[PDB]
Design a protein around this motif. Structure first.
Motif, PDB file in Angstrom:
ATOM      1  N   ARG A 239      72.853  13.420   5.633  1.00  0.00           N
ATOM      2  CA  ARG A 239      72.406  14.223   4.287  1.00  0.00           C
ATOM      3  C   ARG A 239      72.061  15.556   4.598  1.00  0.00           C
ATOM      4  O   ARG A 239      72.079  15.912   3.268  1.00  0.00           O
ATOM      5  CB  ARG A 239      70.951  13.361   4.271  1.00  0.00           C
ATOM      6  CG  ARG A 239      70.999  12.065   3.378  1.00  0.00           C
ATOM      7  CD  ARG A 239      69.732  11.299   3.612  1.00  0.00           C
ATOM      8  NE  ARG A 239      70.217   9.807   2.970  1.00  0.00           N
ATOM      9  CZ  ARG A 239      70.924   8.983   3.254  1.00  0.00           C
ATOM     10  NH1 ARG A 239      71.926   9.291   4.290  1.00  0.00           N
ATOM     11  NH2 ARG A 239      71.294   7.766   2.814  1.00  0.00           N
TER      12      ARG A 239
ATOM     13  N   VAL B 156      51.902   7.470  12.407  1.00  0.00           N
ATOM     14  CA  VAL B 156      52.572   7.468  11.081  1.00  0.00           C
ATOM     15  C   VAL B 156      54.178   7.581  11.566  1.00  0.00           C
ATOM     16  O   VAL B 156      54.452   8.303  12.632  1.00  0.00           O
ATOM     17  CB  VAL B 156      52.311   8.818  10.274  1.00  0.00           C
ATOM     18  CG1 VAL B 156      51.429   8.527   9.339  1.00  0.00           C
ATOM     19  CG2 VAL B 156      52.237  10.108  11.041  1.00  0.00           C
TER      20      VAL B 156
ATOM     21  N   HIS C  14      51.948   4.749   7.286  1.00  0.00           N
ATOM     22  CA  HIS C  14      51.031   4.374   8.284  1.00  0.00           C
ATOM     23  C   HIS C  14      51.235   2.892   9.121  1.00  0.00           C
ATOM     24  O   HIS C  14      51.713   2.125   8.416  1.00  0.00           O
ATOM     25  CB  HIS C  14      49.657   4.385   7.794  1.00  0.00           C
ATOM     26  CG  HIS C  14      49.041   5.722   7.612  1.00  0.00           C
ATOM     27  ND1 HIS C  14      49.667   6.535   6.473  1.00  0.00           N
ATOM     28  CD2 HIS C  14      48.401   6.637   8.310  1.00  0.00           C
ATOM     29  CE1 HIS C  14      49.241   7.733   6.450  1.00  0.00           C
ATOM     30  NE2 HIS C  14      48.358   7.700   7.747  1.00  0.00           N
TER      31      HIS C  14
ATOM     32  N   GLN D 186      62.225  19.835  -0.657  1.00  0.00           N
ATOM     33  CA  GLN D 186      63.476  19.660  -1.025  1.00  0.00           C
ATOM     34  C   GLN D 186      63.935  21.118  -1.856  1.00  0.00           C
ATOM     35  O   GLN D 186      65.026  21.493  -1.625  1.00  0.00           O
ATOM     36  CB  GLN D 186      63.612  18.547  -1.807  1.00  0.00           C
ATOM     37  CG  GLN D 186      63.257  17.217  -1.423  1.00  0.00           C
ATOM     38  CD  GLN D 186      63.871  16.542  -0.514  1.00  0.00           C
ATOM     39  OE1 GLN D 186      65.378  16.779  -0.356  1.00  0.00           O
ATOM     40  NE2 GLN D 186      63.536  16.027   0.598  1.00  0.00           N
TER      41      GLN D 186
ATOM     42  N   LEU E 180      56.118  17.437  -0.820  1.00  0.00           N
ATOM     43  CA  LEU E 180      57.495  16.709  -0.759  1.00  0.00           C
ATOM     44  C   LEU E 180      58.540  17.302  -1.534  1.00  0.00           C
ATOM     45  O   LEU E 180      59.650  17.416  -0.967  1.00  0.00           O
ATOM     46  CB  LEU E 180      57.345  15.369  -0.757  1.00  0.00           C
ATOM     47  CG  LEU E 180      56.342  14.551   0.188  1.00  0.00           C
ATOM     48  CD1 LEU E 180      56.624  13.292  -0.081  1.00  0.00           C
ATOM     49  CD2 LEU E 180      56.731  14.978   1.762  1.00  0.00           C
TER      50      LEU E 180
ATOM     51  N   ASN F  37      61.683   5.602  13.968  1.00  0.00           N
ATOM     52  CA  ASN F  37      61.933   6.861  14.415  1.00  0.00           C
ATOM     53  C   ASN F  37      63.414   7.204  14.511  1.00  0.00           C
ATOM     54  O   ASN F  37      63.444   8.284  14.697  1.00  0.00           O
ATOM     55  CB  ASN F  37      61.037   6.849  15.818  1.00  0.00           C
ATOM     56  CG  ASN F  37      61.073   8.567  16.310  1.00  0.00           C
ATOM     57  OD1 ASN F  37      60.559   9.682  15.722  1.00  0.00           O
ATOM     58  ND2 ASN F  37      61.776   8.887  17.299  1.00  0.00           N
TER      59      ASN F  37
ATOM     60  N   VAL G 281      57.827   1.278  15.422  1.00  0.00           N
ATOM     61  CA  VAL G 281      58.138   2.680  15.781  1.00  0.00           C
ATOM     62  C   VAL G 281      59.137   3.102  16.319  1.00  0.00           C
ATOM     63  O   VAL G 281      59.882   4.149  15.731  1.00  0.00           O
ATOM     64  CB  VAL G 281      56.782   3.272  16.672  1.00  0.00           C
ATOM     65  CG1 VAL G 281      57.005   4.546  16.997  1.00  0.00           C
ATOM     66  CG2 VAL G 281      55.737   3.166  16.041  1.00  0.00           C
TER      67      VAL G 281
ATOM     68  N   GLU H  90      67.065   8.361   9.969  1.00  0.00           N
ATOM     69  CA  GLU H  90      66.887   9.665   9.438  1.00  0.00           C
ATOM     70  C   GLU H  90      65.973   9.907   8.308  1.00  0.00           C
ATOM     71  O   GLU H  90      65.834   8.751   7.371  1.00  0.00           O
ATOM     72  CB  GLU H  90      68.406   9.793   8.880  1.00  0.00           C
ATOM     73  CG  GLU H  90      69.583  10.247   9.773  1.00  0.00           C
ATOM     74  CD  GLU H  90      70.462  10.857   9.346  1.00  0.00           C
ATOM     75  OE1 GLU H  90      70.555  11.670   8.093  1.00  0.00           O
ATOM     76  OE2 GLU H  90      71.767  11.038   9.910  1.00  0.00           O
ATOM     77  N   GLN H  91      65.189  10.717   8.388  1.00  0.00           N
ATOM     78  CA  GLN H  91      64.349  10.895   7.330  1.00  0.00           C
ATOM     79  C   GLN H  91      64.898  11.555   6.171  1.00  0.00           C
ATOM     80  O   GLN H  91      65.931  12.445   6.362  1.00  0.00           O
ATOM     81  CB  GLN H  91      62.994  11.792   7.654  1.00  0.00           C
ATOM     82  CG  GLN H  91      63.417  13.164   8.455  1.00  0.00           C
ATOM     83  CD  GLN H  91      62.037  13.949   9.007  1.00  0.00           C
ATOM     84  OE1 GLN H  91      61.111  13.272   9.246  1.00  0.00           O
ATOM     85  NE2 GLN H  91      62.301  15.214   9.100  1.00  0.00           N
ATOM     86  N   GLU H  92      64.638  11.080   5.012  1.00  0.00           N
ATOM     87  CA  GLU H  92      65.440  11.782   3.666  1.00  0.00           C
ATOM     88  C   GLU H  92      64.261  12.434   2.640  1.00  0.00           C
ATOM     89  O   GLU H  92      64.416  13.058   1.931  1.00  0.00           O
ATOM     90  CB  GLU H  92      66.208  10.491   3.157  1.00  0.00           C
ATOM     91  CG  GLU H  92      65.790   9.789   2.939  1.00  0.00           C
ATOM     92  CD  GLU H  92      66.745   8.726   2.051  1.00  0.00           C
ATOM     93  OE1 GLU H  92      67.280   7.595   2.252  1.00  0.00           O
ATOM     94  OE2 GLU H  92      67.375   9.249   0.835  1.00  0.00           O
ATOM     95  N   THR H  93      63.123  11.760   2.965  1.00  0.00           N
ATOM     96  CA  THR H  93      62.202  12.080   2.020  1.00  0.00           C
ATOM     97  C   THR H  93      60.811  12.677   2.706  1.00  0.00           C
ATOM     98  O   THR H  93      60.047  13.611   2.084  1.00  0.00           O
ATOM     99  CB  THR H  93      61.531  10.629   1.460  1.00  0.00           C
ATOM    100  OG1 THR H  93      61.748  10.747  -0.226  1.00  0.00           O
ATOM    101  CG2 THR H  93      60.389  10.187   1.816  1.00  0.00           C
ATOM    102  N   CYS H  94      60.612  12.566   3.995  1.00  0.00           N
ATOM    103  CA  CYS H  94      59.500  12.847   4.733  1.00  0.00           C
ATOM    104  C   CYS H  94      58.204  11.994   4.219  1.00  0.00           C
ATOM    105  O   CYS H  94      57.108  12.511   4.572  1.00  0.00           O
ATOM    106  CB  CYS H  94      59.378  14.559   4.896  1.00  0.00           C
ATOM    107  SG  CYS H  94      60.759  15.103   5.673  1.00  0.00           S
ATOM    108  N   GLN H  95      58.133  11.230   3.297  1.00  0.00           N
ATOM    109  CA  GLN H  95      56.994  10.368   2.860  1.00  0.00           C
ATOM    110  C   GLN H  95      56.552   9.449   4.128  1.00  0.00           C
ATOM    111  O   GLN H  95      57.270   8.873   4.828  1.00  0.00           O
ATOM    112  CB  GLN H  95      57.459   9.351   1.827  1.00  0.00           C
ATOM    113  CG  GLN H  95      56.220   8.386   1.592  1.00  0.00           C
ATOM    114  CD  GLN H  95      56.927   7.489   0.186  1.00  0.00           C
ATOM    115  OE1 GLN H  95      57.584   7.891  -0.632  1.00  0.00           O
ATOM    116  NE2 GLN H  95      56.442   6.248   0.287  1.00  0.00           N
ATOM    117  N   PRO H  96      55.289   9.872   4.504  1.00  0.00           N
ATOM    118  CA  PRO H  96      54.813   9.092   5.818  1.00  0.00           C
ATOM    119  C   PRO H  96      54.418   7.477   5.345  1.00  0.00           C
ATOM    120  O   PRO H  96      54.158   7.188   4.226  1.00  0.00           O
ATOM    121  CB  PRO H  96      53.563   9.643   6.010  1.00  0.00           C
ATOM    122  CG  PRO H  96      53.002  10.262   4.392  1.00  0.00           C
ATOM    123  CD  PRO H  96      54.271  10.770   3.947  1.00  0.00           C
TER     124      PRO H  96
ATOM    125  N   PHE I  54      58.123   8.414   9.115  1.00  0.00           N
ATOM    126  CA  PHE I  54      58.599   9.030   8.017  1.00  0.00           C
ATOM    127  C   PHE I  54      59.826   8.534   7.536  1.00  0.00           C
ATOM    128  O   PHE I  54      60.803   8.331   8.083  1.00  0.00           O
ATOM    129  CB  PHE I  54      58.814  10.409   8.374  1.00  0.00           C
ATOM    130  CG  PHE I  54      57.398  11.052   8.604  1.00  0.00           C
ATOM    131  CD1 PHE I  54      56.585  11.834   7.721  1.00  0.00           C
ATOM    132  CD2 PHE I  54      57.001  11.039  10.011  1.00  0.00           C
ATOM    133  CE1 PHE I  54      55.428  12.101   7.948  1.00  0.00           C
ATOM    134  CE2 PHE I  54      55.462  11.796  10.746  1.00  0.00           C
ATOM    135  CZ  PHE I  54      54.975  12.102   9.332  1.00  0.00           C
TER     136      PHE I  54
END
Lengths: 189, 317
Positions: B183, A186, A130, B112, B108, A119, A115, A122-128, A188
């Motif tokens: 980014r 979760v 689990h 964007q 998602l 964490n 985690v 950097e988030q680039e997609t925000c796809q989670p 990201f």
């Protein structure tokens, strides 16, 4: 379902699980979060320590030299040989950049490390993704049991209509059935 | 590609499209992704010519095909934002897909595209009635996603939170202490919007970003909030406080509120998972230069959560 299983040294709990999951048709990778690789030695306060850059085969030969007898007896040569047949060396989680649906950790300290790492990316997609913990003791027998429980969990998840919507209910059933706690969070991408 | 060097790109696209037509399984995606590369990257002048043929796959029975189309809409619009004029209906219809993974993918993609549409609106020399209508559609889709916080599906709600998080950030100003991801350095934000713009009203957007934050804060104290959605919301507030530290006060207040009032519906291991993430996010906000103003309060909460004095110091400056 793309799964990662993570232990401390990527030697025992995660590799037992990698082996069972892989054999049962899952897409699986395995990792360790430890600073270094630890293997049991002649006494509980005398483990063998290696860098993550060291091959399972190098560990095998090193241990074969040190005490052929002790490391045949405590299953470590057999474990190393099993490991070699999967991949050439243990892998650090913090070094990989692959995406998973589900990351299973084999003790709470490893969960914390996974985690912390995700964490801080950097988030680039925000796809989670689990992340679920089960506390598994680091010995061959508990590793095997833990791997079959993990396989059972992954099986259930694969049969569910909607993984994100049902996973917590599933984990709660698994808690009640197994008597073991399953932390769940979760992170990201 | 044998004799690939003798083909026009157009011909090769036509051949590939007829090929995909023939393929009755998910491997058609490989072909369709090749088409995407050809018409979006290799020769963007063909993008318009072939748009309808790719968009036609939005009715494919395959989940993975419909998700590919959304990803294609995303890239197409990033290549030529004017395509949003004819693709926003399709995106919003995909938001309303029967399949939850297709819907989550649309969320998602909107995370964007919303900021890209807003920049387009801001930069435009002139704005047609059609472009105005397009922005109304984008804005209304953003509002629909905000309402997905009240979905009965956990995964949908987690994705709505991430969209809401991104909106709060887009609709508020960067400041001197904002910690901006690499980014995102060139993303539009409120301070980039001229106060005297003909169409986009700075003050309206400001009130929309604030109300989005308020909705998120309300959501967080909902008595039946799930373990995952609460941990998502906690992370989103930490990202907001770091990127937009004028909200740091609201974020800290929300953390204090949660800490004093854990939703009682969380199972035992869920309480533990959530508390662990509260500590994690408090530590994260502590590290940010702008937490100097809230340091006694953060310290107090962290001690309460069982954080050792030594760990706090490590996360200090």
């Amino acid at each position: 379902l793309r799964v990662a299983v993570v232990s401390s040294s990527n030697q025992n709990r995660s590799m037992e699980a990698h082996n069972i999951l892989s054999k049962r048709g899952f897409s699986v990778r395995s990792f360790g979060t430890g600073t270094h690789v630890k293997l049991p030695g002649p006494a509980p306060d005398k483990p063998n320590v290696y860098d993550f850059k060291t091959t399972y085969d190098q560990m095998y030969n090193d241990l074969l030299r040190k005490d052929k007898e002790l490391y045949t007896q405590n299953g470590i040569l057999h474990m190393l040989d099993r490991n070699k047949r999967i991949k050439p060396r243990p892998e650090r989680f913090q070094n990989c950049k692959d995406l998973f649906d589900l990351i299973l950790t084999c003790e709470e300290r490893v969960y914390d490390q996974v985690v912390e790492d995700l964490n801080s990316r950097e988030q680039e997609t925000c796809q989670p993704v689990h992340v679920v913990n089960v506390d598994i003791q680091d010995n061959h027998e508990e590793a095997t049991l833990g791997a079959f429980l993990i396989c059972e969990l992954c099986q259930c998840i694969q049969h569910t209509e909607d993984m994100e919507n049902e996973i917590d209910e599933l984990l709660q059933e698994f808690e009640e059935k197994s008597g073991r706690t399953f932390l769940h969070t979760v992170c990201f991408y | 590609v044998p004799r690939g060097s003798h083909m026009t790109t157009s011909e090769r696209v036509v051949d590939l499209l007829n090929q995909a037509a023939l393929i009755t399984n998910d491997s058609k995606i490989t072909v369709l992704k090749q088409v995407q590369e050809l018409i979006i990257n290799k020769d963007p002048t063909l993008l318009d010519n072939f748009l309808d043929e790719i968009i036609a796959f939005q009715a494919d029975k395959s989940i993975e095909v419909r998700k590919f189309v959304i990803g294609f809409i995303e890239e197409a619009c990033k290549r030529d934002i004017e395509l949003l004029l004819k693709l926003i209906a399709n995106l919003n219809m995909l938001l309303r897909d029967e399949n939850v993974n297709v819907v989550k993918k649309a969320i998602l993609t909107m995370t964007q595209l919303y900021k890209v549409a807003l920049q387009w609106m801001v930069k435009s020399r002139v704005i047609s009635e059609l472009q105005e209508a397009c922005w109304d559609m984008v804005s209304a889709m953003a509002g629909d996603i905000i309402l997905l916080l009240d979905s009965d599906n956990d995964g949908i709600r987690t994705h709505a939170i991430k969209f809401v998080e991104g909106l709060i950030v887009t609709l508020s100003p960067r400041m001197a202490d904002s910690e901006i991801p690499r980014r995102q350095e060139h993303d539009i934000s409120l301070d980039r919007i001229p106060r005297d713009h003909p169409y986009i009203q700075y003050n309206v957007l400001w009130e929309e970003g604030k109300a989005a934050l308020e909705q998120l804060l309300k959501f967080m104290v909902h008595p039946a909030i799930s373990s995952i959605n609460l941990t998502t919301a906690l992370g989103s507030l930490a990202n907001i406080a770091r990127q937009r530290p004028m909200f740091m006060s609201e974020v800290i207040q929300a953390y204090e509120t949660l800490h004093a009032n854990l939703p009682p519906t969380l199972a035992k291991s869920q309480v533990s998972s959530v508390r662990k993430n509260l500590k994690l996010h408090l530590l994260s906000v502590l590290k940010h230069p702008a937490s100097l103003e809230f340091q006694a309060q953060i310290t107090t909460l962290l001690v309460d959560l069982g954080t050792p004095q030594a760990e706090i110091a490590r996360n200090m400056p």
